[PDB]
Amino acid sequence: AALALL
Amino acid sequence: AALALL
Amino acid sequence: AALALL
Amino acid sequence: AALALL
Amino acid sequence: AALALL
Amino acid sequence: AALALL
Amino acid sequence: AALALL
Amino acid sequence: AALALL
Amino acid sequence: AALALL
Amino acid sequence: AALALL
Amino acid sequence: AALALL
Amino acid sequence: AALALL
Amino acid sequence: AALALL
Amino acid sequence: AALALL
Amino acid sequence: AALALL
Amino acid sequence: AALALL
Amino acid sequence: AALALL
Amino acid sequence: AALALL
C-alpha cells in the first residue's frame, strides 16, 4: 500500500 | 490532496 | 485499487 | 475532483 | 470499475 | 461532471 | 455499463 | 446531459 | 441499451 | 427500468 | 432533476 | 441500480 | 447533488 | 456501492 | 461533500 | 471501504 | 476533512 | 486501516 496526504 | 494505492 | 481526492 | 479505479 | 467526480 | 465505467 | 452526467 | 450505455 | 437526455 | 423527472 | 436506472 | 438527484 | 451506484 | 453527496 | 465506496 | 467528509 | 480506508 | 482528521 502507498498513501499520501499533501 | 489525498492519494491511495491499495 | 487507486483513489485520489484533488 | 474524486477519482477511483477498483 | 472506474469512477470520476469533476 | 460524474462518470462511471462498471 | 458506462454512465455520464455532464 | 445524462448518457447511459447498458 | 443506449439512453440520452440532452 | 429508466425514470427521469426534469 | 431526478434520474433512476433500475 | 444508478440514482441521481441534481 | 446526491448520486448512488448500487 | 458508491455514494456521493455534493 | 461526503463520499463512500463500500 | 473508503469514506471521505470534505 | 475526515478520511477512512477500512 | 488508515484514518485522518485534517
UniProtKB/Swiss-Prot annotation, chains A, B, C, D, E, F, G, H, I, J, K, L, M, N, O, P, Q, R:
ADP-ribosylated. The ADP-ribosylation is retained in the virion during infection. It is found in: Virion; Host cytoplasm; Secreted; Host extracellular space. Homodimer, homotetramer, homooligomer with RNA. Both monomeric and oligomeric forms interact with RNA. Interacts with protein M. Interacts with protein E. Interacts with NSP3; this interaction serves to tether the genome to the newly translated replicase-transcriptase complex at a very early stage of infection. Interacts with host NLRP3 and ABHD8; these interactions disrupt the association between NLRP3 and ABHD8, increasing NLRP3 stability, ultimately leading to increased inflammasome activation. Packages the positive strand viral genome RNA into a helical ribonucleocapsid (RNP) and plays a fundamental role during virion assembly through its interactions with the viral genome and membrane protein M. Plays an important role in enhancing the efficiency of subgenomic viral RNA transcription as well as viral replication. Attenuates the stress granules formation by reducing host G3BP1 access to host mRNAs under stress conditions. May block host chemokine function in vivo, facilitating viral replication and transmission. Acts by being secreted into the extracellular space where it competes to host chemokines for binding to host glycosaminoglycans (GAG). Belongs to the betacoronavirus nucleocapsid protein family. This is Nucleoprotein. It comes from Severe acute respiratory syndrome coronavirus 2 (2019-nCoV).
